[PDB]
Amino acid sequence: ASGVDDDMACHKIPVEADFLYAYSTAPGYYSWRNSKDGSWFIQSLCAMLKQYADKLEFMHILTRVNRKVATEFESFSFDATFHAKKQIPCIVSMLTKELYFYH
């Protein structure tokens, strides 16, 4: 097969490639933070990195962060509007390879 949009003589990659955005919350949602222990996301991210950075690929680590935040945290507020709310982090990957912090 052959085409007009493949196998270019001069190899290029997107200028937007190789970026990864680890968002604390889903698009359009508030992000929760405990005034004493820190944000649910950063707390969880650090904990998972500490425990798995030398054992798992980055996306799998972030998936563990997603589960920790989703299951272990729920807001507490005297304002019923903001009470008992949940949060799910959002991994946005435009990476082109697996990422391990170790080698």
Partner 1 sequence: SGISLDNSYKMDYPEMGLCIIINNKNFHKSTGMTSRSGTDVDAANLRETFRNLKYEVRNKNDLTREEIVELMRDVSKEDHSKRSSFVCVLLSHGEEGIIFGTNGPVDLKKITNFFRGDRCRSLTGKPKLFIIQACRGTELDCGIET
Q: What residue has token string 């390879």?
A: 97
Residue 10 touches partner 1, criterion: CB under 8 A = yes
Binding mask 3-32 for its own copies (x = CB under 8 A): xxxxxx--xxxxxxx--------x--x--x
Whole-number Å distance between alpha carbons of 12 and 5: 12
The Cα-based distances of 39 to 6, 28, 87 in angstroms read 45, 17, 11
Whole-number Å distance between alpha carbons of 17 and 23: 17
Residue closer to its own copies, measured from CB, 35 or 102: 35
With CB under 8 A as the contact rule, the residue among 5, 12, 72, 80 that binds partner 1 is: 12
What, of partner 1, its own copies, none, does residue 100 touch, CB below 5 to 8 Å by kind? partner 1
Residue 6 touches partner 1, criterion: CB under 8 A = no
Whole-number Å distance between alpha carbons of 34 and 75: 9
Residue 72 touches partner 1, criterion: CB under 8 A = no
Encoded amino acid at 90, one letter: C
Identify residues 63-92 at the interface with its own copies (CB under 8 A): 63, 66-67, 70-76, 86-92
The Cα-based distances of 69 to 42, 76, 98 in angstroms read 10, 15, 23
Identify residues 75-94 at the interface with partner 1 (CB under 8 A): 81-82, 84-88, 90
